[PDB]
Structures are given as C-alpha cells and as structure tokens.
C-alpha cells in the first residue's frame, strides 16, 4: 500500500500557459492525509511559474495550504492538525500548477519533478509508510 503522488503532462507552444495537475491515489488506502510537504523542480529557462492553486481535494486551502514557486523550485504545504473534516480524505487532484513556457529551437519535453524528499502524514498524526512519487513534465513544441 502507498499513496501514489503523481506530477501530470502538458503539452504546448512556445508562450502559451499549460495546467500541471499534481495527484494523489489511494488516500484513504493510507488512512488519509493530514499534513504533506514536498517540492517539484522544473527548469526555469524553459517554464516560468505562473500560478500554483490547491486543488479540489484539499478543503479550507486559505488555512490548510501553502504553495510558492521560486526558480525552478516549488514548495506544496499541507497542514491540518485538528479538524477532521478538513483533512484530504479523496483522491483527486492536489494542486495545480500553471505555467508559461518559453522558447524552444526544437521540440523539447522538461520534466517536472520530486526534489530534496518531503513528509507525508495521515490524519492520525502518523508518518505514510510508502509514498510513489511519479514526475511529470511539459512538451514545448516550436511554433
């Protein structure tokens, strides 16, 4: 049993702004999530961050949620210690990330990916036993 992280794919052109969706899968399987803290890198002479927006399963994003994007690194925080209808108790999409790609001289594919590890805790204060962490990445075709 683990909770299954995946970084999703987009594909796009040169100035146009792609959504990266980052999932969780079996959630409950884990006895849910209560608090996570990971980082993907992305090359940032290729993607410019745009926006990183909590997704539809994490409840109360304002209070539980913090995401910041800093060159080719971003930061996902989750944290909800107390309030049991809070807690990320689905699977579905975590967080989204868009971003704006540059340009290309051919068509290139950049990888999204997990970086410097992270903690995953379920919704009795425990540490998630297994984690699969899958990265994505971004398709830039020259236009």
Same mark, same amino acid.
């Given at each position: 049993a683990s909770l299954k992280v995946t970084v999703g794919t987009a594909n796009g052109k040169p100035g146009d702004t792609v959504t990266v969706p980052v999932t969780f899968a079996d959630v409950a399987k884990m006895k849910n999530v209560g608090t996570c803290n990971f980082y993907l890198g992305y090359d940032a002479s290729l993607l410019e961050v745009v926006s990183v927006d909590a997704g539809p #399963? +994490?409840?109360?994003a304002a209070v539980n949620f913090s995401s910041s994007a800093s060159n080719g690194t971003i930061s996902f925080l989750f944290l909800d210690n107390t309030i049991t209808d809070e807690l #990320?108790?689905?699977?579905? +999409?975590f967080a989204n990330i868009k971003f704006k790609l540059k340009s290309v001289t051919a068509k290139t594919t950049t990888p999204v990916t997990f970086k410097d590890g992270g903690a995953f805790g379920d919704g009795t204060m425990s540490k998630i036993a297994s984690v699969t962490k899958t990265n994505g990445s971004v398709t830039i075709d020259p236009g």
């Open positions: #399963i +994490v409840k109360n #990320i108790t689905a699977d579905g +999409v």
